[PDB]
Design an enzyme around this catalytic site. Structure first.
Site, PDB file in Angstrom:
ATOM      1  N   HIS A 159       0.810  -1.210   0.000  1.00  0.00           N
ATOM      2  CA  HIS A 159       0.000   0.000   0.000  1.00  0.00           C
ATOM      3  C   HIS A 159       0.845   1.263   0.000  1.00  0.00           C
ATOM      4  O   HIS A 159       0.294   2.357  -0.177  1.00  0.00           O
ATOM      5  CB  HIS A 159      -1.069  -0.036   1.095  1.00  0.00           C
ATOM      6  CG  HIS A 159      -0.619   0.417   2.445  1.00  0.00           C
ATOM      7  ND1 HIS A 159      -0.299  -0.444   3.473  1.00  0.00           N
ATOM      8  CD2 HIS A 159      -0.529   1.666   2.956  1.00  0.00           C
ATOM      9  CE1 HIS A 159      -0.019   0.262   4.554  1.00  0.00           C
ATOM     10  NE2 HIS A 159      -0.146   1.545   4.265  1.00  0.00           N
ATOM     11  N   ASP A 196       0.017  -7.537   1.783  1.00  0.00           N
ATOM     12  CA  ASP A 196       0.478  -6.147   1.786  1.00  0.00           C
ATOM     13  C   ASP A 196       2.004  -6.116   1.891  1.00  0.00           C
ATOM     14  O   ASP A 196       2.589  -5.813   2.935  1.00  0.00           O
ATOM     15  CB  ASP A 196      -0.191  -5.367   2.912  1.00  0.00           C
ATOM     16  CG  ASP A 196       0.038  -3.868   2.808  1.00  0.00           C
ATOM     17  OD1 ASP A 196       0.517  -3.422   1.739  1.00  0.00           O
ATOM     18  OD2 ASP A 196      -0.285  -3.154   3.790  1.00  0.00           O
ATOM     19  N   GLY A 207       2.113   6.702   8.748  1.00  0.00           N
ATOM     20  CA  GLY A 207       3.481   7.077   8.473  1.00  0.00           C
ATOM     21  C   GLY A 207       4.497   6.021   8.849  1.00  0.00           C
ATOM     22  O   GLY A 207       5.656   6.107   8.421  1.00  0.00           O
ATOM     23  N   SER A 222       3.777   2.833   8.104  1.00  0.00           N
ATOM     24  CA  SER A 222       3.498   1.789   7.125  1.00  0.00           C
ATOM     25  C   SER A 222       4.741   1.405   6.349  1.00  0.00           C
ATOM     26  O   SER A 222       5.520   2.256   5.921  1.00  0.00           O
ATOM     27  CB  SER A 222       2.457   2.264   6.115  1.00  0.00           C
ATOM     28  OG  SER A 222       1.203   2.404   6.721  1.00  0.00           O
ATOM     29  N   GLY A 223       4.879   0.100   6.124  1.00  0.00           N
ATOM     30  CA  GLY A 223       5.977  -0.442   5.357  1.00  0.00           C
ATOM     31  C   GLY A 223       7.212  -0.747   6.171  1.00  0.00           C
ATOM     32  O   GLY A 223       8.099  -1.462   5.686  1.00  0.00           O
TER      33      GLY A 223
HETATM   34  N1  F05 Z   1      -1.256   0.076  13.689  1.00  0.00           N
HETATM   35  C1  F05 Z   1      -1.896   1.090  12.881  1.00  0.00           C
HETATM   36  N2  F05 Z   1      -2.978   1.720  13.196  1.00  0.00           N
HETATM   37  C2  F05 Z   1      -3.349   2.725  12.115  1.00  0.00           C
HETATM   38  C3  F05 Z   1      -2.225   2.518  11.150  1.00  0.00           C
HETATM   39  C4  F05 Z   1      -1.965   3.141   9.938  1.00  0.00           C
HETATM   40  C5  F05 Z   1      -0.880   2.746   9.181  1.00  0.00           C
HETATM   41  C6  F05 Z   1      -0.051   1.736   9.631  1.00  0.00           C
HETATM   42  C7  F05 Z   1      -0.301   1.109  10.839  1.00  0.00           C
HETATM   43  C8  F05 Z   1      -1.394   1.507  11.603  1.00  0.00           C
END
Ligand code: F05
Ligand code: CA
Length: 223
Positions: free
Chosen positions: A40, A84, A175, A177-178
């Site tokens: 994503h 993902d 933020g 993510s990844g």
């Molecule tokens: N653990 C998480 N809660 C909201 C979110 C957004 C993006 C990545 C991880 C999370």
């Protein structure tokens, strides 16, 4: 990361920042030329930034290397976030050292109860927004599949696991993510999703890297 701690500069040497004019996702360096991140996080025009601590300051250990190609998992579904995971190749190999280092892929899937290290430059607030600029860290256990499914009925696939705290207060967030979830020195998870951040009974959900080792190795070997 909500409820974490300041890691310390270059103490997470496999952590990368993906930059497209600004930081937008984390990733993990898995050899001198390849990064693992979340599907994503895909977009064009990615520069991989290694050796970072404050992502707004050039402090002296950074390597900035543009991506030559990205490979989203063939079965990634952006609605369910199943699978993902993506791979990003660097145009040139990073120069590996004590502060820029790869993380091993797992030999085995890690079990519920195992402690892991989750890291990133994401939001540190469960209500509102604040970005920390230096890397934040969180120690958190993997949760049982049954408690993960109970927290998110109908949403947890065999390619996901939960980690964190059902009481809330400590989680990954937007933020992050990844980025990496490392347990016993191996990359077991990728920061993927959750419902809000650090909310009660809504732990973080992570891509289960051990299911992808063959795909990662075969993809790297031919690209
Ligand atoms: N653990 C998480 N809660 C909201 C979110 C957004 C993006 C990545 C991880 C999370
Ligand atoms: Ca920097």
């Amino acid at each position: 990361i909500v409820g974490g701690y300041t890691c310390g500069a270059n103490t997470v040497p496999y952590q990368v920042s993906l930059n497209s004019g600004y930081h937008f996702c984390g990733g993990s360096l898995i050899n001198s030329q390849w990064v693992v991140s979340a599907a994503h996080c895909y977009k064009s025009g990615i520069q991989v930034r290694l050796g970072e601590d404050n992502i707004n300051v050039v402090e002296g250990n950074e390597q900035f290397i543009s991506a030559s190609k990205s490979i989203v998992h063939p079965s990634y579904n952006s609605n369910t976030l199943n699978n993902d995971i993506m791979l990003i190749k660097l145009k040139s190999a990073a120069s590996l050292n004590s502060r820029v280092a790869s993380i091993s892929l797992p030999t085995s899937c890690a079990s519920a109860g195992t402690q892991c290290l989750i890291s990133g430059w994401g939001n540190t607030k469960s209500s509102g927004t604040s970005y920390p600029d230096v890397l934040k860290c969180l120690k958190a256990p993997i949760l049982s599949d049954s408690s993960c499914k109970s927290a998110y009925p109908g949403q947890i696939t065999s390619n996901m696991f939960c980690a964190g705290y059902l009481e809330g207060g400590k989680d990954s967030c937007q933020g992050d993510s990844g980025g990496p979830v490392v347990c016993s020195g191996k990359l077991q998870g990728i920061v993927s999703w959750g419902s809000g951040c650090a909310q009660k009974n809504k732990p973080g959900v992570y891509t289960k890297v051990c299911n992808y080792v063959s795909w990662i190795k075969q993809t790297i070997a031919s690209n």
